[PDB]
Amino acid sequence: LTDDGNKWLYKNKDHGMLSAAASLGMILLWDVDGGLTQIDKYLYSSEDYIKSGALLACGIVNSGVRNECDPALALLSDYVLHNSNTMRLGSIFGLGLAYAGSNREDVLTLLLPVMGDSKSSMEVAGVTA
Amino acid sequence: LRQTENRATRCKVERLQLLLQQKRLRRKARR
């Protein structure tokens, strides 16, 4: 994946790309700089599957380190909004797992509104719960 | 719409990359 993960993600199909990309963050766990560097290229793909998988990768990378800076917060609150589709489960789960122990009212108040908005299907609702 | 969202994402990615570089420079300065 680190050598050439783009072809790997593309040969992955259907919903696989989400987890296939999140594996990048799992590999680049606790390394914010490396995760960002290796995920930026995949962060912009025509299919939202790869984008959401990249958001999960960044969330995983941020998970486990309590850096006072919040690149995960910024990047992932940018997408917490459904963006006219339900494919924000990745963003929500990434934010959660990234800030598990933070208990920041900022992230709580970012997550709770989107949890009920008449458009958060049960999938999104459970993920944000 | 999606393209301009990608552009804004790229802008914030560059911002946070610069911030992280500054942070790690400052950290390595003392450690």
Cβ pair A119, A86 in contact under 8 A: yes
Residue with tokens 């999140």: A22
Closest-CA residue in chain B for A37? B17
Taking the C-alpha atoms of residue B15 and residue A51, their distance in angstroms, rounded to an integer, is 19
Q: How far is CA A76 from CA A5, A13, A55, A73, in A?
A: 22, 24, 7, 5
Residues on chain B touching A33 (C-beta within 8 angstroms): 17, 20-21, 24
- Nearest in space to A97 (alpha carbons), one of A41, A46, A38, A57: A57
Amino acid, single-letter form, for residue B21 = Q
B18 to chain A nearest CA, in Å? 10
Closest-CA residue in chain A for B27? A67
Residues B10, A123, A22, A65: is their CA dihedral positive or negative?
Answer: positive
Residue A85 near chain B (CB below 8 Å): no
Residues on chain A touching B24 (C-beta within 8 angstroms): 33
- Sequence-ordered list of residues with C-beta below 8 angstroms from that of A35, at least 6 positions apart, any chain: A24, A25, A28, A29, A57, A58, A60, A61, A62
CB atoms within 10 A of CB B20: 17
Amino acid, single-letter form, for residue A113 = P
3-state secondary structure of A72: helix
Phi, psi of A28 (to 5 degrees): -90, 50
Cβ pair A24, A5 in contact under 8 A: yes
Residue A74 near chain B (CB below 8 Å): yes
Phi, psi of A97 (to 5 degrees): -60, -25
Method: cryo-EM
Q: What is the DSSP letter of A103?
A: -
Taking the C-alpha atoms of residue A53 and residue B14, their distance in angstroms, rounded to an integer, is 20
Entry resolution (Å): 3.4
* DSSP sequence for A2-49: TTTHHHHHHHS-TTHHHHHHHHHHHHTTT-HHHHHHHHHTTTS-SSHH
Amino acid, single-letter form, for residue A20 = A
Q: How far is CA A104 from CA A59, A98, A116, in A?
A: 16, 12, 20
Chain B residues touching chain A at CB-CB below 8 Å: 5-6, 8-10, 12-13, 16-17, 19-21, 23-24
Q: Are B21 and A74 in contact (CB < 8 Å)? A: no
* DSSP sequence for A60-87: HHHTT---SS-HHHHHHHTT-S-TTSST
- Nearest in space to A31 (alpha carbons), one of B24, B11, B19: B24
At what angle are helices B2-30 and A32-40 packed, to 10 degrees? Answer: 150
Closest-CA residue in chain A for B4? A44
Rg (chain A; Cα; Å) = 14
